[PDB]
Design a protein around this ligand. Structure first.
Ligand SMILES: CC(C)(COP(=O)(O)OP(=O)(O)OC[C@H]1O[C@@H](n2cnc3c(N)ncnc32)[C@H](O)[C@@H]1OP(=O)(O)O)[C@@H](O)C(=O)NCCC(=O)NCCS
Ligand SMILES: CC(C)(COP(=O)(O)OP(=O)(O)OC[C@H]1O[C@@H](n2cnc3c(N)ncnc32)[C@H](O)[C@@H]1OP(=O)(O)O)[C@@H](O)C(=O)NCCC(=O)NCCS
Lengths: 376, 376
């Protein structure tokens, strides 16, 4: 089996509560209908705390000009990469192995574009071996954590086929608040309310996966085994979510139809996942969502609610997903790892969890990424 | 074994010769020393033909303003994606299988950033199945073709581990001429000569790979088997090559030290590759470059020469690499596939080639990507 053997996450350090966002908005823009509507919505997201790499007194929030794309890149390098290094180091510490033994690095972000990519820098910071096998995923957004898991899972199975040890570091790093000034400016000029301003926060998170070959005493035993992962792209959904490039960074388009789409896509993806899993596809009970633990990427509050109802679950089933959302908001590709961390921590402290766990996240496409994890 | 079973490429249709580039440059810029130096270098690259998606009368070459990043994205969608669709379709045609049986898609570009990424569009254009397993690689540049091969190779071994059929479509798509207007403008303003203006052309290319499981009569037999792929990142080389984001796209920095670095990195990477290949690592003869066929990404004319001399090879050994460079220039992640295509075509027409073939490409990092292919 391929197993998860290390987990860690690191939210940015500075709170970006509703009062903080309002202060930023009103500092730079006079009252307009879109500004007032955004601020009203901002207080109703049911997010208690979001985090930014930028403190309230940082020039990012006070400067009169919108950051150039080059500045946005430099800010990601300055603030995002250290967050990623820390999360990665901590996941390697959780694993217990040595950086030298990492054979694969699978990285993901949708808040930076660079050549070389941030994964290259991370190899140096962490002291990974010169022949570590890197993949930097692009284009997927909120689907990215599970996507990285899917990719790493199969790469590790490939090493199992060769009979050699493999250990993958998965690293997700997102600094969406870098683009907050640009988004505010676009909202003011167009008067199109952009709820991205209300939902997103900064975070990095990491996993270590193992193919179980060449296990050493220093290594943590499997936390979960990864049984199967399956993506689905849905026709007729292209316009639903976009993160489009422009002169001052990326601009988010978040269609109001996402929660309703979620309610239809998630159960369809679940059925498809189970159907594609030979060890489970034949028994009828395996097609009942309540027979599994669940972790759902919280694209927004209404996304959790839509998934919850459509799958026949309770809010308590998704407690860890609501908790992650409430304390950190939507941190894009990192959120699913934050939720896994919460679930792991609860189990350590005595919680009763089911033996199978389903991960699900809606990403650009529209794509649904899923995975099934099992208790060892 | 994992095998290559389909190959195709498609350069853009419009020639961008020395006269054409000079016409474009002088149309928008009065003479300066850096302009004259660039144009002088341009006629010495030993590239006979480069191609652009933009014809001589296209507004891209006549507009008085520099394209915004949003326009650059739209242009890639308008011109790049069709190029990728055509190359992909042709590779699938070469393979002979059904688009529905493609299990994995591994895509790469360094001339577009989008959410969803261009791979998502390609799935729809080609009619790939809803659960096709996509990866869009980022951050690697000229290393990208071999990088995609490395990733696809391991993913397919992962399916072999599971005992199921796997067929990967690899697609590389590069439209660097989209950024030519921005690059010209930066060169005028800074007076920093940018040889990127002289080297790069537009192209898409594709491979189909198979893990050999569930082989159908309709499918082409292995062209090459992929034995092993090995990347190396070299410390102390970070600033040697960068493709950095800014308001109007990406800007290339091409250090004069690249050919010198190539001459050191390639033999080192070759030795590492063989050392890491169990079926070859023991015999002394296997560490001699002349005992293999070679395909080297032509970063520029001087890069080919540096690799040739350092490996003890002749220009004739690298004939297909020089040929690809001469007719198409540096097409970034697609060039290595163009060379494989040339080598396939020559062999089909009766040429004598060696049993083993090494692919090598210098990419951002600085990274060297390598692969060893064998005749079935
Ligand atoms: C934003 C959100 C937290 C608001 O929660 P709520 O107040 O319970 O939701 P409501 O249905 O009451 O919406 C309240 C207001 O928000 C607006 N709103 C909701 N989603 C919106 C979107 N995507 N864009 C613009 N406005 C939106 C509604 O139009 C409504 O405006 P009104 O008061 O003028 O009628 C909730 O709608 C949500 O979680 N949406 C999903 C966000 C999403 O798609 N996330 C994925 C990002 S990739
Ligand atoms: C550009 C190139 C084709 C020129 O070929 P050449 O004329 O045989 O090479 P030379 O050494 O005679 O160089 C001629 C001029 O080009 C200039 N030049 C070469 N490489 C350069 C670079 N990367 N940046 C700026 N100028 C460069 C030299 O300084 C020299 O200028 P000078 O005539 O004022 O002295 C060749 O240098 C080359 O292939 N370089 C490598 C390109 C590269 O790094 N590719 C990777 C892109 S990722």
């Amino acid at each position: 089996s391929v197993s998860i053997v290390g987990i860690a996450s690191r939210c940015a350090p500075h709170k970006l509560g509703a009062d903080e966002l309002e202060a930023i908005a009103r500092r730079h823009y006079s009252s307009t209908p879109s500004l007032e509507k955004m601020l009203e919505i901002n207080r109703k997201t049911r997010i208690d705390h979001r985090y930014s790499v930028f403190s309230s007194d940082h020039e990012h929030w006070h400067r009169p000009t919108i950051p150039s794309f080059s500045e946005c890149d430099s800010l990601f390098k300055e603030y995002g990469i250290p967050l990623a290094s820390a999360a990665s180091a901590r996941a390697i510490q959780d694993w217990g192995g040595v950086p030298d033994e990492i054979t694969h690095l699978v990285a993901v972000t949708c808040t930076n574009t660079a050549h070389p990519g941030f994964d290259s820098v991370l190899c140096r910071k962490l002291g990974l071996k010169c022949n570590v096998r890197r993949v930097l995923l692009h284009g997927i957004g909120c689907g990215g954590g599970i996507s990285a898991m899917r990719v790493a899972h199969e790469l590790l199975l490939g090493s199992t086929q060769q009979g050699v040890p493999a250990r993958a570091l998965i690293v997700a790093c997102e600094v969406p608040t870098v683009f907050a000034r640009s988004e505010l400016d676009i909202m003011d000029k167009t008067q199109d309310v952009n709820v991205a301003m209300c939902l997103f926060g900064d975070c990095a998170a990491a996993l270590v996966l193992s193919n179980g070959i060449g296990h050493k005493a220093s290594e943590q035993r499997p936390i979960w085994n990864i049984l199967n992962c399956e993506p689905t792209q849905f026709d007729g959904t292209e316009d639903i979510a976009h993160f489009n490039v422009h002169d001052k960074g990326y601009h988010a388009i978040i269609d109001k139809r996402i929660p309703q789409l979620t309610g239809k896509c998630v159960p369809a993806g679940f059925q498809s996942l189970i159907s594609s899993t030979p060890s489970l596809a034949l028994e009828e009970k395996n097609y009942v969502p309540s027979n599994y633990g669940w972790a759902v990427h919280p694209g927004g509050y209404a996304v959790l609610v839509a998934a919850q109802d459509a799958l026949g679950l309770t809010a308590d089933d998704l407690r860890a997903s609501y908790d992650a959302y409430r304390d950190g908001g939507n941190t894009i590709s990192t959120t699913i790892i934050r939720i896994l961390e919460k679930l792991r921590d609860e189990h350590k402290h005595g919680s009763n969890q089911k033996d199978k766990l389903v991960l699900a996240a809606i990403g650009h496409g529209i794509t649904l990424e899923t995975a099934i994890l099992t208790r060892p």
